């Protein structure tokens, strides 16, 4: 049993296993206590499993947010850091509210940020939004683009109907069968 990765997190190992089982190679997950997890594969599947590690860029990085750069425990916070910490929690709350719709499995929402808001004498510009979604299959995903636009329009001060762009898609084919051990 050759060793691919070690020292992973918990949700970093369920992504590598779910990627490797899509390509007919079977991996074993081994806990090592405080030192994390580890993933081992068989011997003839080694030179084919390092290729999908390099291709899919595994292990996954932690997902980044705008509110992580400006920590709340600073002694003094600028008016730029308070509006960036506002808009990052708004797009984090609108993303979790999009997953409770009828058919949506996952979603992601982006807002335009204002950076030079108070440093100019100019008033701020209009607000633009964008969204992505993944739907359960068997759904007419062309008519379901008019509900996310209606939901996202009057969740802000004044956005137009052409300043919102929704790009959504159905999910991939299901993997339900076992890979299979390599007989030699």
């Amino acid at each position: 049993d050759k060793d691919l990765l070690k020292g992973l997190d918990q949700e970093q190992a369920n992504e590598v296993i779910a990627v490797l089982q899509m390509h007919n190679i079977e991996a074993n997950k081994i806990d090592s206590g405080k030192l994390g997890y580890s993933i081992t594969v068989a011997e003839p599947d080694f030179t084919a499993a390092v290729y999908w590690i390099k291709t899919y860029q595994l292990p996954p990085r932690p997902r980044v947010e705008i509110a992580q750069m400006f920590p709340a425990d600073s002694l003094v916070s600028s008016p730029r850091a308070e509006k960036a910490r506002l808009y990052s929690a708004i797009e984090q709350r609108l993303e979790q509210s999009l997953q409770t719709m009828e058919g949506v499995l996952s979603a992601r929402v982006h807002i335009s940020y204002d950076i030079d808001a108070g440093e100019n004498g100019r008033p701020p510009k209009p607000v633009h939004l964008s969204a992505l979604a993944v739907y359960e299959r068997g759904s007419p995903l062309a008519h379901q683009i008019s509900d996310i636009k209606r939901f996202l329009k009057n969740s802000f001060a004044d956005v137009d109907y052409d300043n919102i762009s929704v790009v959504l898609s159905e999910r991939s084919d299901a993997q339900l069968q076992a890979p299979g051990t390599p007989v030699k």
Binding site: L75, V76, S78, P79, G118
Partner: protein, 53 residues
């Protein structure tokens, strides 16, 4: 007058933090030289945004 209250209590908050931190430390000056000019320059950067706007 809420921006008069917030700016009038951040000054007393910084006197307790800044002037009272080497009280509990001394009860080394190069590491405390760079900390004080960051906070005073940022508090003065904030009070003009609360003043001229």
């Amino acid at each position: 007058m809420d921006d008069l209250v917030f700016a009038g209590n951040k000054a007393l908050y910084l006197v307790l933090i800044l002037s009272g931190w080497p009280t509990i430390v001394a009860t080394c000056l190069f590491l405390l030289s760079g900390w004080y000019g960051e906070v005073l320059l940022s508090y003065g950067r904030q009070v003009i945004f609360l003043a001229l706007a």
